[model samples]
Target: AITSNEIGTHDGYDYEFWKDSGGSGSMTLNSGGTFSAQWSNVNNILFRKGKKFDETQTHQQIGNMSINYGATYNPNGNSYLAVYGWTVDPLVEFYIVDSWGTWRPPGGTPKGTINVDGGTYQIYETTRYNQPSIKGTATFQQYWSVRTSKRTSGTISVSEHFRAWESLGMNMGNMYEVALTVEGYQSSGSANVYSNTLTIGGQSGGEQATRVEAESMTKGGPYTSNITSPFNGVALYANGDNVSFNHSFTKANSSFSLRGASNNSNMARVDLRIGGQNRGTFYFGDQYPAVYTINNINHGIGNQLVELIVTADDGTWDAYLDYLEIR
Candidate 1:
């Protein structure tokens, strides 16, 4: 049976529908993680359903989720096809917008950009003043990762978006729920979700490369040498210096890559160590900002301490560290 303005477990899936004054919407839960929804003249509305986690849990504790969905979304006016959710404690509302209609959301400047799932999403943070939320009408923050390019069907690395938001200093509260949501604001829309699959509690395998900026690391150079372009307007200069990072990698077979340049005509050698064990070394070169990669790294599960120790100082054998990529 189709439902309206309600939330409950249906067909082994948690479902929800909320309609503001002057809004109308309905959601029909189909078997095997499929559903259909429609809304009209909504002041604001959200139709969605997915996993519900304990309020004491963080995204890390809940583990990563790979959301695969296919939908024929027809939206008018301000509408969004997205993965949306809420959190308590600090009370945060987050959106991973996959597609939208007539009006794009959060209509403002983005804090930064994150590369994810073969697309670059502009990260935005906005506050909702006394708006409707899970705990009734209350004020809270809204984090957004709006796709620069839109899509109607594909996989979304939900955890990657969460990590990117965190990297930008948008802290999230304890978990409440993470769901595939369709929202409408003073608009009308219809979405036929033919397929929806959540591969929950696993490693992230999306194209979103986890980026660690060299300038942001604790032990690195604030060397703003007269170089043309160092990543993020700064680079770490290492001359017999060691810069390390304490990173939590999500992949078991994750690879390591570095971006920087070396002044010494002889390539500088930087040894890579993970969890206090030597993984490998990347030989980097001349004045150009080129990327060096060690494609096979055996990074065991959980949090690992990563280190890059420079071992050569010949002709001022110095090298600049731009950033690191883990995938």
Candidate 2:
């Protein structure tokens, strides 16, 4: 039977306590007191001990707990013994206890086992016996490999995914202990190992996030750039102000031009730059809207900053400047 209470008073009975007219069962008090072996028969008879109870006879019961596994690798030899995997070279050592109640590397034998088919075979041997077991508990190390493939220029993404299986002698059944170690040479030519265990089950659908963004930007160059006013107003520039706008710059070979349009035919234009290089004067028919976006423009040194300078081509026009985002 389940019971609950939200007692509001702080009296002695504020907490729930179980009273036992004990017989074949026991009654418990949330207040930590128990009356055991009190009841006599199936017929509910009140049994009370009149003698004063001895407070000194009471002992506290220990709580239930499990160690599970911690990420730290306590070194056993050249390697460290972690939950799922072992460190390479400076090998992390680990041990396993079989379902037969025998320790792998056999109590006195300093050996390691490799899982194959449906069994485990000794792989490496240690010189000393009866020295000490790597891990005092029943556990084993799992090995994993990370590989990358396919290459693309200008912005790419990488991801990691993993699956697990139980090993024999591990006898872990569905209750397998797994840890992950990430060790390999990165594209930058450096080898690295994960300093901590990567929990597998915790990574439900495969953890993923953007790791890198690679894109090519035009370096140095001479160029003319243009961005036509989208509002069809005269492009205007302040002496010391920034011009910014919201737009997409994803596709390659796309361009925009800054120009003043009189109608659907005549367009007066200014400087233009592509991939940071100067492109002399050019005219784009006014069939398009008053707004023009020039792809990548390369302006020479001292002019790396992109700005639009416009005075009255025919009449006075006002332009709105929006917020500039660095990224």
Candidate 3:
């Protein structure tokens, strides 16, 4: 069932929905890059999902994103359908708007214009004084590329706008996320996203990723490998344990994907180790298994070790590990 405030992964893509304290909305993310949303009397609302970069990637190394979507967007006051994301160092919010209703956004000083993707886009830069950010509530800059013409459906070559923004002196930081988003502000509306596709990593369609079940790997600490479904018949689970899996790979420039769930009342943290090196940490708060993909990982060719250790400081590390996929 779809619910409000849903934040997780589907088909290896991150999905999220956000709204103001007293606002109301709901989003349902289906298989792959498809979704639907409705919002009313919201101060601000955002529905999005796509690739999340690990803050170590530059625009050139980040690869390109191709987004195709069709929607019945009817916003009364203000709304937008675009490619949106965030960057850290300089702390910037960016949008490549292909469609909007009622009010155009990020209106500030006009930087210039760029001709690409069969359209002319006007650049705009604006500042948000102490607003909500991925890091926290802080001040940041917003970069925008408003297409001279608006459309509801088509292909958006995302990297092209990033390149154009760089040429306009709007330097970007390492990416936090790049998503196909539908946003509404101080308005009431409903959007049916009948079709949406966000493709990255120079791939046109879904590719197979090697899967390794957690129960088939080595278990550390007091854990059990007899869990039931939603966990591939059997999985690894315990209140503060670790699991290690060994796999063979053909590429060093690869990513690690995990399917897991947290049973604790609060979020649980797990440290990721790849080839005996610390990759990073990921949090889990939902009981339903969600996919987490750690990108830009440098894995050695042939067989390598991958480990997931529950951090001790988080108290009870009540979670389940279903599998790991390397690609």
Candidate 4:
């Protein structure tokens, strides 16, 4: 016998159920072998045979009803039990079996009964019961076929895939942004669940060339007269070092020229050549001011000739030209 709400001396149980006067009690055993008692609403207690009874009897004379339970309150309370189970006792009753094979006991209001076949099953109480309870015979194989004769080892590469590539023209320009999120609980508890502005328009790929053409230069002495096409040219010198020009281009144009006649300004000179080494030498002020333009150069494979040589340090003065452009 042992019912509690506290009343001291509780070990090695023989019987004791006292402590009431607002202190509650019911830990008893007194089939006249007496152990302890003092009641005032001691709610049912009896363990006879080995004799110990404190009141209330009749469950077929309490013969084989053994109930040794334990429980105390106040571990921070919410008055506990919002739900207690063992089939939520209302004298316990539940049944389900239909489709014309009746056994119905769960009716409307808060009592259960469910048997639906064509899909639609939502019996919720926040369904949760994490797994792990496998009983009885189980024989399942396929973990690399039983560990390959026990020396085990198996792995055959390649297994992570995702690829995308697209481009086809009509008028395309928008620059990417794609999003989707709905990660869980928060609304008015403020913010989270994003993805709104979406704008994606089609077509892309193809179109080239905006401006091209690179080098051309001319203006040099020593000619017999006839150089016209360094973007419109002329070069002539007859006796005493005959020099003549015959220029014409536009097959990947490139031409260079420079010449001088001096007043002893380093003996007046001009020398230029391409495809034939010796690229520069012009002195009349020893060459520096007379700048020619055009230089995008890089079309090589045909039509390129540039040669110019004009000299006179003792010829006293006889050749002077420097100016040409195209790019």
Candidate 5:
């Protein structure tokens, strides 16, 4: 669900500018393998470029990744690149790569650190649920790096991040875009990358940039028996248990919905809790398997260890969830 009115090329690479606070600049990759941007009155602009890559493999497929050097005129900007994609558990925007800025997620909170590539980065996780007009019911997990120092250049082993996140209980899922852009905030400055070459997984003969759908992921989970995707929808049932969706992500328009149908509505009910805070409970008041939605939910920060208890019922409530559209 990526909206791109612009997906063009500049200098010598392919890039996408999704957001920018405000600024004017030229991003270029010269024949000398130099990728740089000169800005004026710029707030923040995000984009990426490089050889084609994939994120569906069991092992890391990135090759010779490096950010040679970036010289910027202000600390008001960061040279960090982020990866965005989807995960099934909650089936929302999985924002793996986060940048640095004062518009940061929850401060004074630490999620430990990971040493990778050629440096050590302190990791932070924040949840955003604000922009429903564009983001829907998706929770964005903003994994930002707490820079130990002002890093201008370094060698990064992308695969190493996969193993590290696995240790932290975060799933990388189907990664799509890998951006290399300058985040500007009244950041009228210039950034020069003498060399910026990075590669993710790819096809044979190389040189392929593309997107992948993460459909295969909806097939596994701790509650596999209770969840089903009939016609590819997220449906859930019961086993003397509750339905706890692994909810996580970051964004603006925040809200969660309970879109489902039960053969017996009055007999089926559920209480919702994300990150252990109880939001509300949903009951299927309908007479048949009609879709009932629990909307207007303002999502808070952090991992949604979402719990859905089948509060009512004889212990065997069959529900269809084509309405994960709230996602």
Candidate 6:
């Protein structure tokens, strides 16, 4: 059967999933939970759905996410793994173009290019009427790069893609769904998509005492400066500078503190991230040897292995540190 339909709940998806095929195409949900789609002339599909992290949550809290993905055939149309979301309002589509059929931006020419984990892409930004989003909004930022190698199959880290886009200042914004979609205009052939295994983990919020030196925090600054300071231990900054303390929590925490300076004009906006879960920035710029603590951040419950990242707010530079005390 080439026709298809929608299911309120499919697999582990809580939202909705759709499947459609052409005159001789077919789709199925195998007994083992594997979803397969084979289409020749079938053009439209919404055979996908996903969830979102709390907008306020930092990437590390949810960044180590992963899943299974695979696809084959369909030389005439196009088959690719894609993620659909919004930048708060407008729709955004990021995809891995596997099969190149009649691929052309329905709205305009290519906007630009970007390089990610597996390949480089010539991005095309366009505005098209989206039937499911804002009633009158068609402006879509379709960021996609044709895969130079074959499509990446098997268990993969979706985190890298998010990191890649974030490097481009294109956050995955309140992700709604990720799917292997198939679309065709007048093409033909068979394409099958496989997605069954899902292994995602979160941090366990609990309390424990951990010892960390100011100079021992991981350095992630590109054009930043760092040195052992006489104030207590170390001072690092570059406005965009970020330092992280990797540890495991056994109980939920209510507060965390770093002994350091608190009056430097630039350290006024230091960001505090717990277990990769971030909250407001605390001031740590007061002329060395002072304690800066971020309180009431209850993170981690069932998850473990977390990161405490301290970042200097953009345009700020001083991040003096002495020691870290977590409780």
TM-score per candidate, chains pooled: 0.63, 0.19, 0.62, 0.14, 0.46, 0.49
Give the clashing pairs for model 3.
none
What lDDT would candidate 3 get against the real structure? 0.77
Instruction: Write the candidate numbers in order of decreasing TM-score.
Output: 1, 3, 6, 5, 2, 4
Model 4: CA > 4 A from native = 1-263, 266-283, 286-304, 311-314, 317-327
Per-residue lDDT over 64-120 for candidate 4, one digit per residue giving the tens place of the 0 to 100 score: 111111112111111110001111111111111111001111122321112222221
List, residue by residue over 110-183, the lDDT tens digit for candidate 5.
56777765566666656666632123545565545544544555554544554565578665544443444554
- Compared with the true structure, all predictions reach lDDT values of 0.78, 0.24, 0.77, 0.24, 0.46, 0.51
Enumerate clash totals for all models, in the order shown. Answer: 0, 32, 0, 20, 28, 18
Query: By the TM-score metric, which is better: model 2 or model 5?
Result: 5
Top model by TM-score, which number? Answer: 1
Error of 6 at 49 (Å): 6.1
- Over the stretch 181-228, how does candidate 2's per-residue lDDT look in tens digits? 111111111111112212111122233321110011212212212233
In candidate 1, clashing pairs total 0
Q: Using alpha carbons, what is the TM-score of model 4? A: 0.14
lDDT of 3 by residue, 181-200 (tens): 98999887877777788765
Candidate 2: Cα lDDT at 103: 15
Write the residue-wise lDDT of candidate 6 on 98-179 in tens digits: 4445453333554455555455555454444554442243555655545445553654445555565566665455544444
lDDT of 1 by residue, 28-141 (tens): 788756788888888988888787777987776666677989999999889898998988888999999989988777888999988888898899999999877888889899
**Candidate 6 residue runs with Cα over 4 Å from true position:** 13-25, 31-33, 49-61, 79-87, 98-124, 129-137, 152-156, 202-327
Rank by lDDT, descending? Answer: 1, 3, 6, 5, 4, 2
Model 2 clash tally?
Answer: 32
- lDDT value for candidate 2? 0.24
Model 4 lDDT at residue 106: 19
Tell me, by lDDT, which candidate is best.
Answer: 1
